[PDB]
Design a protein around this nucleic acid. Structure first.
Ligand SMILES: [Mg+2]
Ligand SMILES: [Mg+2]
Ligand SMILES: [Mg+2]
Ligand SMILES: [Mg+2]
Ligand SMILES: [Mg+2]
Ligand SMILES: [Mg+2]
Ligand SMILES: [Mg+2]
Ligand SMILES: [Mg+2]
Ligand SMILES: [Mg+2]
Ligand SMILES: [Mg+2]
Ligand SMILES: [Mg+2]
Ligand SMILES: [Mg+2]
Ligand SMILES: [Mg+2]
Ligand SMILES: [Mg+2]
Ligand SMILES: [Mg+2]
Ligand SMILES: [Mg+2]
Ligand SMILES: [Mg+2]
Lengths: 252, 201, 109, 175, 139, 190
RNA sequence: GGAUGAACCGAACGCCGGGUUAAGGCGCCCGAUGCCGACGCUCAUCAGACCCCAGAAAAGGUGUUGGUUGAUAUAGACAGCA
RNA sequence: CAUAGCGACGUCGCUUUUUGAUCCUUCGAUGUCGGCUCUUCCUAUCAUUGUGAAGCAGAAUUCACCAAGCGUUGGAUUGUU
RNA sequence: AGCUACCAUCUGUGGGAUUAUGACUGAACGCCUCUAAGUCAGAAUCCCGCCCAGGCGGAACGAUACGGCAGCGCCGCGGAGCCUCGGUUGGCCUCGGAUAGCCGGUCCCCCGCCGGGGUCCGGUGCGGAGUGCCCUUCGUCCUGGGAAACGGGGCGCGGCCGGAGAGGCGGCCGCCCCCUCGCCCGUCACGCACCGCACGUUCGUGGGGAACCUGGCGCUAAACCAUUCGUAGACGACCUGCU
């Protein structure tokens, strides 16, 4: 029979596999739609949540009760030392999706970036990219890299820059840098490839990506809370005090 | 036979083509179907879209992840139609289903090969001209397929390359006809041999 | 120098829907797609040639891994050019969809 | 009664002679039946309805097939019949074009089954006549009364769809 | 768009059926599916015949509808359909496939040899024409 | 029943000529070119005269439903001829009880802005179909003129305007406000 | 054989080989129409698809196909315009 | 003013959310009312979206269509439904 | 401090085909008609996006094992052999498509010497044909005539070009080394001719796994545990640090 009184469902099925994230960084999963009319620009950045504080500001919202009034608002500080661009990836559209076509890494990859490739940096010989960096210097390798860039130019539909954070500028225990692919939007493939090539090994401050008073998206991993019951996890109604085998449960 | 039978899905009716393909792969033959977005289904587009949406509604109430898997690409739709005509829960049916490859568009292995056509599954002979029909590519796109546009662009590129190849082939055929005209007294001894036995009217 | 045998496919056993008579097999001969075209192949010897692990004696040759099951075409089956065949031992079910050779041996022409 | 290709039968029968009438009258019928056995059965079925005659109380003195007297001439046949529908009985007049009367009657049986779902036991043919083209009433029959008749065959459907079953060329329809 | 019509006097080729491979003349039409058909010089007596087994040719004879076999045969013999038919590409295509089917093993061997020589000469000349055309020098 | 033949002929004036590419009719007149393909209808299209330019539409072995398409094709071709010779002009009067309907014609008569329909602040922007030009008549007070060559496109643009100006949640027998197609005619009136 | 099924349809049973059938079938699952099968009817934005049997009525349709009866009309029908 | 909205006398249905009728399963046992909790489903739609009709001037209302996405509550009395 | 409360605070989103419905053009049915063919607008519905997970599903890229006889990679078809799995018994290297229509060829014009048009010519039960085409296996020796001789064969080198949808492929040049043989019709004899008999004939130098010898060119790494961290945590797992 129908339930006695209507009540909305507890929790959402849109976030349903309530499991620990398979990643720690938090991946973009969707970059802004690229239009060639815009100038060449980056679409993402990596920061570190430092803490919260609150501000005071005068509101400029006409028709509101707080128009030309001073309000306090909670704000979050996200420390953002400049990223360093170390690679370029091209993707090609196929009837099965986007696939990675070619990856070109810069010479002189920083040690903090290189730590990402090692689980045990202490015991390693730090051999990563040491044979790759030689083809930036020999003639045949340079011709091969020019061929790779030409192929990206004439085949890839979207390109991204592999950029890493600078953990040496942060007060944390971690020294291993964070790498991510930031899609380059706004231009033709040749133009964004030239832009990325000139930005190889370079520093991109957060000024060049984001601006004042604009709405952005924050992608991350929430605070872990461990194994939790239904009352904390799904915010269901607690059973009465007289319940025998436990009241922090779902009855049916 | 021994070679891989490559069929072009354009202009073919879904069930007729699937029945032919199922029998072929059960007879030990290897079949590759290309351009599954060009496959037609009899009946108007709204009729067929309602059929696929009714299929979409069939999911396991307890766990849709366990439930029926509704594939959205036209190649996968045709593949599931063939699987419905194979005994796929036995080893023989599974091997037969392994012998079948289905593609949207035409990938590079088969874009430079000749494509067969199955007349018994062709819309032009199997449907009355006044009847409505539906396109598998459009149906897939409207039930959830995501690669209709990129497949269209790649198909246009492939068609341009094939046009270039065909123009070269026509040039070679013209040149061969000219060569046959040029050597006539030196060929007519064997041309009459072919003519008396019916080759080369 | 040449093939000298017609290609056929072991399609299955003579069967109803829920019964199977394994003592006789159905063969689909390549290029024969009507019942009236099967008259040529009636009585022709047919061979299921396979390979195994241990060597076996080859008549007129050295031992190899080739084995054969012999049989012959007995009658036509249906209207679509399929035939029935009797083999000395019933064909293994693993051979369904595999090659049978029709040897042209007992020729009537 | 089932069917096949029908053929006309002249069936003549009469009652058995009895000491109330020593020479009973002879009755003749046209019966369109698959064979002479069905022809005799239908003759008894019809004379039992018309006269007070039964197969046991009578006999068939003749049953011979009626050959078409002009099977090389196209002609129009008008058929008057009655048949039982699902909700009553109706009298119908239909028209056909054929060379043979039995062919026209077979056409009528197929057509009645096709259009009215009527079965051959429901259908009861009561008159078949060869009508002149100026006396035809059905437009489908009338449209072929043209001395300068001319039409193409517009959309020729391929009928050897399995010889070959697989091919590189798509079939042509225009001819 | 249509060029060949079913009419009185149209000569049709019989594709399949009991009279397959013969020529007939359409004498009359019955009920959209059949035709009174007479080949008096091709050994096909007057009879009904479905339009499905007919393939219309380009020959039309001049006689009134449902005329007798005498007049159909006279119209066939005058402006002889047999010779004009045999002179068409259609008829010699039929003849060529007939003799190709009746070709024997020795004939197939000889055809293989002749085709070998012919193909070699033709492709040598094709290569020569390509090499000649490769001499291009112009703005 | 299958009628053996159903045919209908249209006459083409001297100033306009018609070309056939299969079932695609190209009608070239003084006022431009129109082009329409009837591949959805299985008919035979023929041009007959080198003096009077008759176009004949034939249907063979049609049934009741597809005999209806012969006159439809003939009417479409006649409308194409009328469009390339005289053109189509739809005059739309705008009616209102209280609030005048302000219509502003944007670029080259391709966009129509209705401002004060029943006095609401919402602005209606109607995009005319390509090849159709809209204008405000200089003769009458509240009247739009839609001129074009394709009757399909002109009448569809007029219907777009008419359905854009639609009263809602009111007794439409009382609230008669809107823009309505007043008359349908030609240009040059020949 | 009816997908499935105590009772329906065919047929009743020792262990086998060959031939042929019944009821029922012959796109593919799945043996068999891969016949150049015949004639029509039918489009369904809940089509239909085979004893028992597993779902439907009254009443409607200017959808289409046949049929019955009556009526008008070259002494000019019907419909449009006047 | 029959049919905006209703529908007498009749008559055809659907549903299994009522109660009967039966006794096919269960008597070497299927825990028997209600409430609480929680999920899902149906539509014969109360509200909301888009609509058509009115005895729809506006406002309010009534009838009907596509439609189950979303919602449908807090209490006194009573074990109660 | 941490956890935590509409008991504080922050954030919550775009498109497509369409339903009902209203229409356009337009027959059926010389009128009308949203419908028959053909079109338009159209929504808390539907599908997708955004968002969550990420296939017995793929991709690109990095590094790839010694201070000692010690492992590995690539190159050679380099050899001689094993173990194990068997299938197959010539190839087709590609227009786009229409079906009440098609295919091929050629002169004038236009798009920067090739394509697209318009003429004209042909073919169309497709013969520039998948009912098709190509290749074709007995091998050699004398021995002439024809095709050729601007020709063939290189697991021979070097260079170049095209191909990204899964390119894993294909083509073109330059140098060198050989045969003037190989294709058709002939002359001439020979080869185990194994004495009627099956699994013969190919792909094929097949795939996979260990091992021996042989030469050349190269490389000298990580993962896990333990320890630590606490952005994590039932335990695993996860984020981290360690001359
Ligand atoms: Mg409820
Ligand atoms: Mg208790
Ligand atoms: Mg009109
Ligand atoms: Mg109101
Ligand atoms: Mg049984
Ligand atoms: Mg059943
Ligand atoms: Mg038996
Ligand atoms: Mg069955
Ligand atoms: Mg079968
Ligand atoms: Mg009882
Ligand atoms: Mg119990
Ligand atoms: Mg129990
Ligand atoms: Mg229990
Ligand atoms: Mg409802
Ligand atoms: Mg809160
Ligand atoms: Mg509508
Ligand atoms: Mg629309």
């Amino acid at each position: 029979s129908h339930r006695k009184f209507s009540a909305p469902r507890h929790g959402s099925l849109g976030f349903l596999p309530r499991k620990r994230s398979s990643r720690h960084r938090g991946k973009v999963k969707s970059f802004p739609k690229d239009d060639p009319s815009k100038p060449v620009h980056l679409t993402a950045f990596l920061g570190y949540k430092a803490g919260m504080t609150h501000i005071v500001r005068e509101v400029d919202r006409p028709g509101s009760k707080v128009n030309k009034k001073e309000v306090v608002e909670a704000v979050t500080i996200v420390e953002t030392p400049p990223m360093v661009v170390v690679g370029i990836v091209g993707y090609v559209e196929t009837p099965r999706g986007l696939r990675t076509f070619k990856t070109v890494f810069a010479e002189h990859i920083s040690d903090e970036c290189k730590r990402r490739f090692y689980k045990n940096w202490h015991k390693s010989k730090k051999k990563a990219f040491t044979k790759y960096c030689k083809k930036w210097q020999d003639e045949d390798g340079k011709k091969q890299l020019e061929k790779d860039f030409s192929s990206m130019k004439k085949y890839c539909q979207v390109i991204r820059v592999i950029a890493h954070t600078q953990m040496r500028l942060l007060p944390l225990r971690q020294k291993k840098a964070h790498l991510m692919e930031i899609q380059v939007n706004g231009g033709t493939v040749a133009e964004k490839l030239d832009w990325a090539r000139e930005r190889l090994e370079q520093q991109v401050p957060v000024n060049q990506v984001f601006g004042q008073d604009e709405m952005i998206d924050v992608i991350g991993v929430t605070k872990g809370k461990g194994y939790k019951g239904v009352t904390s996890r799904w915010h269901t109604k607690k059973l009465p005090r007289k319940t025998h085998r436990g009241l922090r449960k779902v009855a049916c | 036979e021994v070679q891989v039978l490559v069929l072009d899905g354009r202009g073919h009716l879904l069930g007729r083509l699937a029945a032919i393909v199922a029998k072929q792969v059960l007879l030990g033959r290897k079949v590759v179907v290309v351009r599954c977005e060009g496959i037609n289904i009899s009946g108007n587009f709204y009729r067929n879209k309602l059929k696929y949406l009714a299929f979409l509604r069939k999911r396991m109430n307890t766990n849709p992840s366990r439930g029926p898997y509704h594939f959205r690409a036209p190649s996968r739709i045709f593949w599931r139609t063939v699987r419905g005509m194979l005994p796929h829960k036995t080893k023989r049916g599974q091997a037969a289903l392994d012998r079948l490859k289905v593609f949207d568009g035409i990938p590079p292995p088969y874009d430079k090969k000749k494509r067969m056509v199955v007349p018994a599954a062709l819309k032009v002979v199997r449907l009355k001209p006044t009847r409505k029909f539906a396109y598998l590519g459009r149906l897939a796109h409207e039930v959830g397929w995501k690669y209709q546009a990129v497949t269209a662009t790649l198909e246009e590129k492939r068609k341009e390359k094939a046009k270039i190849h065909y123009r070269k082939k026509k040039q070679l055929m013209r040149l061969r006809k000219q060569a046959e005209k040029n050597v006539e007294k030196k060929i007519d001894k064997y041309t009459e041999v072919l003519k008396t036995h019916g080759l080369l009217v | 120098s040449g093939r000298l045998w017609s290609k056929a496919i072991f399609a299955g056993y003579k069967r109803g829907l829920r019964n199977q008579r394994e003592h006789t097999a159905l063969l689909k001969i390549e290029g024969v797609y009507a019942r009236d075209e099967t008259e040529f192949y009636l009585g022709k010897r047919c061979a299921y040639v396979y390979k195994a692990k241990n060597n076996t004696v080859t008549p007129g040759g050295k031992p190899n891994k080739t084995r054969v099951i012999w049989g012959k075409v007995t009658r036509a089956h249906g209207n679509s050019g399929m035939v029935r065949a009797k083999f000395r031992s019933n064909l293994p079910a693993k051979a369904i969809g595999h090659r049978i050779r029709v040897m042209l041996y007992p020729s009537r022409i | 009664k089932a069917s096949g290709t029908l053929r006309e039968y002249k069936v003549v029968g009469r009652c058995l002679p009895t000491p109330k009438c020593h020479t009973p009258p002879l009755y003749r019928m046209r019966i369109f039946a698959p064979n002479h056995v069905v022809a005799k059965s239908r003759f008894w079925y019809f004379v039992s309805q018309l006269k007070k005659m039964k197969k046991s109380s009578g006999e068939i003195v003749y049953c011979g097939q009626v050959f078409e007297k002009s099977p090389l001439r196209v002609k129009n046949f008008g058929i008057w019949l009655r048949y039982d529908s699902r909700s009553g009985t109706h009298n119908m007049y239909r028209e056909y074009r054929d060379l043979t009367t039995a062919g026209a009657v077979t056409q009528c049986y197929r057509d009645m089954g096709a259009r009215h779902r009527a079965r051959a036991h429901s259908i009861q043919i009561m008159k078949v006549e060869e009508i002149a083209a100026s006396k035809c009433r059905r437009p489908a029959v009338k449209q072929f009364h043209d001395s300068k008749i001319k039409f193409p065959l517009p959309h020729r459907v391929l009928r050897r769809q399995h010889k070959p079953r697989f091919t590189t060329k798509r079939p042509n329809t225009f001819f | 768009v249509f060029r060949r019509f079913v009419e009185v006097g149209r000569v049709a080729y019989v594709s399949f059926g009991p009279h397959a491979g013969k020529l007939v003349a359409i004498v009359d039409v019955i009920d959209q599916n059949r035709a009174l058909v007479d080949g008096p010089c091709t050994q096909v007596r007057r009879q009904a015949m479905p339009f499905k087994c007919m393939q219309l040719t380009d020959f039309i004879l001049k006689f009134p509808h449902s005329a007798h076999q005498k007049y159909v045969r006279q119209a066939w013999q005058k402006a002889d359909i047999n010779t004009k038919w045999a002179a068409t590409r259609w008829a010699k295509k039929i003849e060529a496939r007939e003799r190709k089917a009746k070709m024997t093993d020795f004939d197939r061997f000889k055809v293989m040899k002749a085709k070998k020589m012919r193909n070699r000469i033709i492709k040598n000349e094709v290569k020569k024409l390509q090499k000649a055309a490769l001499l291009k020098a112009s703005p | 029943m299958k009628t053996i033949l159903s045919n209908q002929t249209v006459d083409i004036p001297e100033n306009v000529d018609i070309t056939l590419k299969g079932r695609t009719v190209i009608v070239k007149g003084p006022r431009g070119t129109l082009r329409r393909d009837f591949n959805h209808i299985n008919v035979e299209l023929s041009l007959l005269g080198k003096k009077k330019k008759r176009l004949r539409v034939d249907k063979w072995w049609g049934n009741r439903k597809e005999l209806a398409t012969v006159r439809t094709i003939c009417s479409h071709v006649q409308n194409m001829i009328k469009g390339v010779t005289l053109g189509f002009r739809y005059k739309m009067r705008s009616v209102y009880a209280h609030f005048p309907i302000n219509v502003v014609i944007q670029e080259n008569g391709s966009l129509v802005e209705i401002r004060n329909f029943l006095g609401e602040k919402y602005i209606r922007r109607v995009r005319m179909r390509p090849g159709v030009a809209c204008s405000v008549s200089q003769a009458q007070k509240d009247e739009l003129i839609l001129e074009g060559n394709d009757i399909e496109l002109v009448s569809n643009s007029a219907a777009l305007i008419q359905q854009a100006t639609t009263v809602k949640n009111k007794d439409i027998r009382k609230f008669l406000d809107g823009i309505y197609v007043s008359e349908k005619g030609t240009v040059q009136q020949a």
